[PDB]
């Protein structure tokens with residue numbers, strides 16, 4: 001019933017990035033610069049296949065410092081993790097949702113079995129609960 | 137003596153990102169959101185190891201759009217490419233410098249043998265002419 005810490009995700013495919021600045025609706029808790037990573041199984045779904053069990057997507061969130069009109073990556077704030085298991089995570093549409101504070105495996109952030117995460121990602125049911133799109 | 141287009145670089149290790157906004161000294165021509173990628177040979181050099189011939193670093197530069205206190209990736213502006221060959225690129229410190237407009241292999245940008253690129257990167261001689269640092 002727990003999402004596994006995605007060891008080695010920094011070596012995975014970089015899907016996209018985005019900056020969430022103060023005033024954004026997602027500033028608490030997702031403000032900063034984030035990078036989306038996908039393991040090989042998640043790439044199958046992002047390409048237009050079905051997401052296989054074992055697909056993992058990671059939302060890697062950094063603080064940033066605005067320094068002379070550059071936004072410079074600071075410390076890692078958290079990672080968000082979506083782990084595909086149609087049976088084990090059936091209550092949240094077949095994705096397990098977890099956060100890790102500072103990307104550390106012992107700093108679990110989700111306290112409601114991922115119902116809040118799922119509530120927002122449910123808007124993307126037609127794209128299998130995933131917002132990010134593959135770009136070249 | 138030409139730098140090879142770095143085919144498949146989007147599958148490589150994501151080193152770091154930064155956002156360069158108007159007012160920054162580098163806004164022309166490096167304004168936007170950029171992502172740095174490294175092949176396996178360049179990871180050896182970045183890790184504190186030495187850079188083998190065949191190491192490639194890519195500077196992947198996107199225009200960005202402001203969207204309600206988010207900065208969202210737009211069109212690719214260009215890629216910058218550094219290819220390691222201590223002997224073939226000896227005139228520019230053992231790295232070959234090339235730019236590809238919109239990341240297209242047909243739009244090579246560098247006209248002066250990479251002397252302009254090298255003039256800026258030469259400040260980083262002590263880190264083998266590479267600015268980027270590995271992070272977690």
Ligand code: HEC
Nearest residue numbers: 018057058059080081082097098099116117120130131132
């Ligand atoms: C809306 C109010 C959100 C809530 C609550 C959560 N997430 Fe989210 N997530 C959201 C958006 C708009 C995006 C896309 C960002 C982009 O760069 O386009 C995301 C993305 C993710 C990802 C990457 C995969 C994807 O769907 O694009 C993951 C792994 C992710 N989110 C996990 C996650 C977890 C674990 C949450 C509860 C702690 C969570 N999200 C809440 C919007 C929203």
Ligand code: HEC
Nearest residue numbers: 154172193194195216217218233234235253256266267268
């Ligand atoms: C100073 C005025 C620069 C000139 C001219 C060029 N580059 Fe550059 N480059 C610069 C900085 C400050 C950085 C680091 C950015 C960051 O996020 O930290 C870079 C980075 C690169 C990279 C990535 C590898 C590295 O050294 O970090 C590449 C592949 C790169 N630059 C290529 C490149 C080429 C091909 C240029 C001439 C067309 C060039 N750069 C000019 C600063 C400057």
Ligand SMILES: [Zn+2]
Nearest residue numbers: 023024204205
């Ligand atoms: Zn506003």
